[PDB]
Amino acid sequence: FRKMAFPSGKVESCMVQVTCGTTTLNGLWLDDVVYCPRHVICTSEDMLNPNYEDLLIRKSNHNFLVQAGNVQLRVIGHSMQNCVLKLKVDTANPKTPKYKFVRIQPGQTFSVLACYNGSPSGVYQCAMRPNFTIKGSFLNGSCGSVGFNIDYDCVSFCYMHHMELPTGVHAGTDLEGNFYGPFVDRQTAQAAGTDTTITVNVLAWLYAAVINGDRWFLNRFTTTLNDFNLVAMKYNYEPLTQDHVDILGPLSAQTGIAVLDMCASLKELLQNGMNGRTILGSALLEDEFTPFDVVRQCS
Amino acid sequence: FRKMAFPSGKVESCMVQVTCGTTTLNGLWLDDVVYCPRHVICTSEDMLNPNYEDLLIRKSNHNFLVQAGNVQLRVIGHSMQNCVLKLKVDTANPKTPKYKFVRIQPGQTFSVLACYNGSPSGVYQCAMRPNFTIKGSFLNGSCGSVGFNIDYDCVSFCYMHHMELPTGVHAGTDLEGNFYGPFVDRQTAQAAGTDTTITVNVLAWLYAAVINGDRWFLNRFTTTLNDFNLVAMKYNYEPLTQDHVDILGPLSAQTGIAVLDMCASLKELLQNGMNGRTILGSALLEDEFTPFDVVRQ
Numbered sequence: 251f252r253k254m255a256f257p258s259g260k261v262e263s264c265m266v267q268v269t270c271g272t273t274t275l276n277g278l279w280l281d282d283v284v285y286c287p288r289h290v291i292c293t294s295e296d297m298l299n300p301n302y303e304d305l306l307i308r309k310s311n312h313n314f315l316v317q318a319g320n321v322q323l324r325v326i327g328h329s330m331q332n333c334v335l336k337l338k339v340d341t342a343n344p345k346t347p348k349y350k351f352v353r354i355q356p357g358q359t360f361s362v363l364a365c366y367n368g369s370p371s372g373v374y375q376c377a378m379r380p381n382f383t384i385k386g387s388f389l390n391g392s393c394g395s396v397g398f399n400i401d402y403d404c405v406s407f408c409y410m411h412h413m414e415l416p417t418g419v420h421a422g423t424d425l426e427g428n429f430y431g432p433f434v435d436r437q438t439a440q441a442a443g444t445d446t447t448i449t450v451n452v453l454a455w456l457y458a459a460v461i462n463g464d465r466w467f468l469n470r471f472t473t474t475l476n477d478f479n480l481v482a483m484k485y486n487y488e489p490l491t492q493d494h495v496d497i498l499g500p501l502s503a504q505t506g507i508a509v510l511d512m513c514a515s516l517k518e519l520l521q522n523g524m525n526g527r528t529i530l531g532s533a534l535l536e537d538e539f540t541p542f543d544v545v546r547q548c549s
Numbered sequence: 550f551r552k553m554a555f556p557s558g559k560v561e562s563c564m565v566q567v568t569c570g571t572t573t574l575n576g577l578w579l580d581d582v583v584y585c586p587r588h589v590i591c592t593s594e595d596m597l598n599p600n601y602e603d604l605l606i607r608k609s610n611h612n613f614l615v616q617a618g619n620v621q622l623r624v625i626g627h628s629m630q631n632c633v634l635k636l637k638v639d640t641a642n643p644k645t646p647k648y649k650f651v652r653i654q655p656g657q658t659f660s661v662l663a664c665y666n667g668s669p670s671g672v673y674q675c676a677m678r679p680n681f682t683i684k685g686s687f688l689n690g691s692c693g694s695v696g697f698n699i700d701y702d703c704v705s706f707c708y709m710h711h712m713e714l715p716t717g718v719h720a721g722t723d724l725e726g727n728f729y730g731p732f733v734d735r736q737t738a739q740a741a742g743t744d745t746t747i748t749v750n751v752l753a754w755l756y757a758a759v760i761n762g763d764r765w766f767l768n769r770f771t772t773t774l775n776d777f778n779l780v781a782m783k784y785n786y787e788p789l790t791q792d793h794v795d796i797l798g799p800l801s802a803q804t805g806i807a808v809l810d811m812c813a814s815l816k817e818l819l820q821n822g823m824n825g826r827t828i829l830g831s832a833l834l835e836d837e838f839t840p841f842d843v844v845r846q
């Protein structure tokens with residue numbers, strides 16, 4: 251049981267470089283549109299406090315250099331949708347996959363294709379934290395990198411990377427250009443709200459640990475849903491809903507451990523700590539696996 | 550600090566499925582040759598004690614079903630090299646990347662493209678353990694999945710997946726079909742050797758912490774390499790090689806911390822513990838990040 255990302259080939263074929271002046275970052279080339287963060291129109295003075303509509307109206311199509319590998323694409327039009335700039339180019343991407351734009355919910359996961367100057371560099375899994383940040387691995391030049399899920403060869407794009415926060419966590423937008431979270435595309439120190447743990451995911455990962463032959467954390471006790479949620483909230487875990495209990499059904503079915511039995515197990519781990527032991531080789535309670543991620547990998 | 554796979558597209562367009570009778574697994578299509586585990590020529594009753602020489606003699610080109618998706622690639626020649634079958638097909642793969650076949654050493658990491666019936670399903674980074682297993686994540690139908698590194702658009706293939714072991718770890722070969730470790734391609738109960746901690750990678754991890762300002766564990770001591778190797782084995786850590794000291798060179802230069810000074814630091818952590826302090830926010834020493842991985846991140 252490992253963190254596993256989707257195969258990234260369908261997305262790699264879509265990554266390009268966008269440059270405006272000296273400012274440069276990654277864009278996503280779908281059919282005859284390149285999507286990228288609007289931040290690319292900013293000079294370094296602009297970045298500190300940008301008025302984007304005002305900066306964009308003073309831009310021309312020829313102010314935009316788009317490179318797909320070694321070839322240049324000619325921008326024939328441009329517009330802005332919230333924090334995303336849409337560059338119309340004169341050539342369709344012939345490797346455009348079947349795709350959708352989706353906005354994911356906190357707790358859901360997606361694969362990140364990290365890119366630098368339009369070249370893909372790595373791929374890994376992230377989750378949308380409950381405070382709408384993600385804990386990724388991004389360096390300078392990764393602006394415009396995208397997150398995505400793939401189901402039956404259709405790519406669902408859900409994240410476009412924008413900035414690193416002072417705490418090292420990451421903030422971005424969906425592909426309509428709305429930020430996840432209360433952030434803005436400005437170069438100024440921004441804090442996130444207090445983060446909490448994705449409870450249903452921790453439960454999924456405990457089930458994974460059982461499917462993989464580890465049970466030291468299980469106990470005899472059971473709890474009620476409300477009594478478990480009291481303890482969870484006390485430890486800054488998100489509440490567990492009855493929908494979450496239902497989503498965990500197959501994993502309870504497969505292992506024969508009732509969900510509220512697993513909750514009783516998690517409750518004790520939260521109160522008594524891990525006492526030095528490890529679950530799936532981790533010393534902390536892992537919360538970036540969804541029930542689907544666990545199912546997809548154990549079956 | 551995350552485990553990061555290489556982008557997988559160059560390898561995705563090389564994955565095919567190979568079927569013999571009802572036995573089906575994954576193969577790798579490069580130019581006009583498909584490479585796959587020879588275990589594919591086994592029926593159920595052959596997998597326990599297969600006679601690969603006598604099984605290949607009953608076989609003709611027309612016994613091999615090779616498919617890119619649902620498209621058949623006609624097999625025009627077949628031969629065995631160690632534990633991999635090489636199938637000559639009538640079509641050169643137009644998406645063949647610039648590639649090499651390499652044999653990796655324990656501690657080196659690589660990306661695994663897990664596949665089922667010729668269809669990629671996931672990608673993740675693995676380290677080769679000192680007992681020549683990998684802590685993979687593989688389901689049934691993953692035989693023939695490959696592991697790789699990508700350097701400047703060149704794909705270096707280093708691993709082809711064959712089997713899961715009772716302990717739940719995995720074993721395979723290089724792309725010339727030579728197993729890593731003391732395993733053989735039979736459906737027999739084989740046990741991984743006792744594993745050890747990858748010392749060069751723990752050191753890389755310590756350099757990563759120092760680069761990030763987390764350096765409490767640095768001490769005023771130094772050691773010789775032989776002295777350190779003899780003590781590391783007593784804590785079930787791998788001894789360091791001359792090549793290991795050299796790939797730590799860039800990190801040693803970046804931080805100004807001599808490789809042997811960092812060994813003395815680790816030796817002190819081995820003999821006394823972390824005493825309740827963390828390194829990169831962790832109480833445990835990570836050993837699956839190589840020095841190259843550390844600098845890449």
Ligand SMILES: Cn1cnc(Cn2c(=O)nc(Nc3cc4cn(C)nc4cc3Cl)n(Cc3cc(F)c(F)cc3F)c2=O)n1
Pocket residue numbers: 272273274275287289290388389390391392393412413414434435436437438
């Ligand atoms: C350390 N880190 C982790 N993730 C990131 C992503 N990131 C980025 O890649 N680039 C940024 N600013 C730029 C500077 C440029 C210099 N040149 C020549 N071209 C540049 C292009 C960019 Cl985008 N930023 C900062 C940043 C980007 C934003 F989109 C934003 F709204 C606010 C910000 F403060 C950045 O975080 N770096």
Ligand SMILES: Cn1cnc(Cn2c(=O)nc(Nc3cc4cn(C)nc4cc3Cl)n(Cc3cc(F)c(F)cc3F)c2=O)n1
Pocket residue numbers: 571572573574586588589596687688689690691692710711712713719733734735736737
């Ligand atoms: C759970 N798991 C994790 N890794 C693996 C890898 N693995 C595999 O995918 N398949 C195997 N045996 C086959 C059975 C088949 C049934 N049909 C219809 N077709 C089949 C093809 C194969 Cl390869 N094995 C077992 C195995 C494969 C070998 F190559 C070998 F030398 C010895 C072995 F015991 C397997 O481990 N499964």
